[PDB]
Design a binder for this molecule. Structure first.
Ligand SMILES: [Zn+2]
Ligand SMILES: [Zn+2]
Ligand SMILES: [Zn+2]
Ligand SMILES: [Zn+2]
Ligand SMILES: [Zn+2]
Ligand SMILES: [Zn+2]
Lengths: 167, 167
């Protein structure tokens, strides 16, 4: 699509043909007038950078745009008060949606862990990072939960291996 | 001691009265002609920074110097070929020293995880970071190993809590 090319051209400010980490950061809003989470940008870029330039070309940027737009849909679906910030109540709705069974008190930990703003509400950039991290911890857990009952038994050495495979 | 003050003055290059992250990095050698591990410096400084300036004053720097010198002793004690780099064989000696019972194959993972050089040998700056991380993972594990048999049983929610308490 040619519309994607206009976005690419606007984001690719040095006109190198490759959008770097700083450039994608500048083209993204988190609705709080602070710079979009550098770690989130780092995650998104390395997720679509097939070569290793620390950036994306147009061919890969189409995947990046797909990815970011998908998150905007999901964020807004679970943004019911339309506050532009997912609250404790809504974060539960989001996770409960995807089949997570977690105690109310544990959502306090998730919010304190991902919210770079103090407000106890999660912005779009932090929300993406949060879910990416959560997905990875679930995938790892499932390797060790061989009977699918939400419990694992691990030795000290198996535990270290588990923690190190997070990267 | 006045000798510590001469070191402080030489390290504190902007003469601010506080040694920052960049300044401590420059005053430290890892014996490989690459910059001392920024994460290691970050760990050491935040370990002795009682206030929050992202640096250390003379009162705290004495603790920093104590800490770094302690690591130099330990590093050299386990540096038997005097290579200036702890090898797989020596890393086992180091860990076995402090009572760790880990398989030979798992030391491959530790080395691949901490060695920023490719050589499969751990430099001084990476060695400090490695052990700090290992100590923290052991402390956390011990909270969940209530009967002290080197095994833990945890639910998915307990697992997430465990991972998040690493920080
Ligand atoms: Zn560019
Ligand atoms: Zn909302
Ligand atoms: Zn089971
Ligand atoms: Zn200074
Ligand atoms: Zn050696
Ligand atoms: Zn037991």
């Amino acid at each position: 699509q040619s519309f994607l090319w206009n976005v690419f051209q606007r984001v690719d400010k040095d006109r190198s043909g490759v959008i770097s980490d700083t450039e994608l950061q500048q083209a993204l809003s988190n609705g709080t007038w602070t710079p979009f989470n550098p770690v989130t940008v780092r995650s998104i870029i390395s997720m679509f950078d097939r070569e290793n330039k620390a950036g994306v070309n147009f061919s890969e940027f189409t995947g990046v745009w797909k990815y970011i737009t998908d998150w905007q849909n999901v964020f807004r679906t679970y943004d019911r008060d339309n506050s532009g910030m997912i609250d404790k109540n809504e974060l539960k709705q989001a996770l409960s949606g995807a089949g997570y069974r977690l105690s109310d008190q544990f959502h306090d930990i998730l919010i304190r862990k991902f919210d770079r703003q103090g407000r106890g509400q999660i912005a779009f950039d932090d929300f993406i990072q949060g879910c990416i991290v959560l997905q990875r911890l679930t995938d790892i857990f499932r390797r060790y939960d061989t009977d699918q009952d939400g419990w694992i038994q691990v030795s000290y050495e198996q535990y270290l291996s588990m923690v190190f495979s997070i990267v």
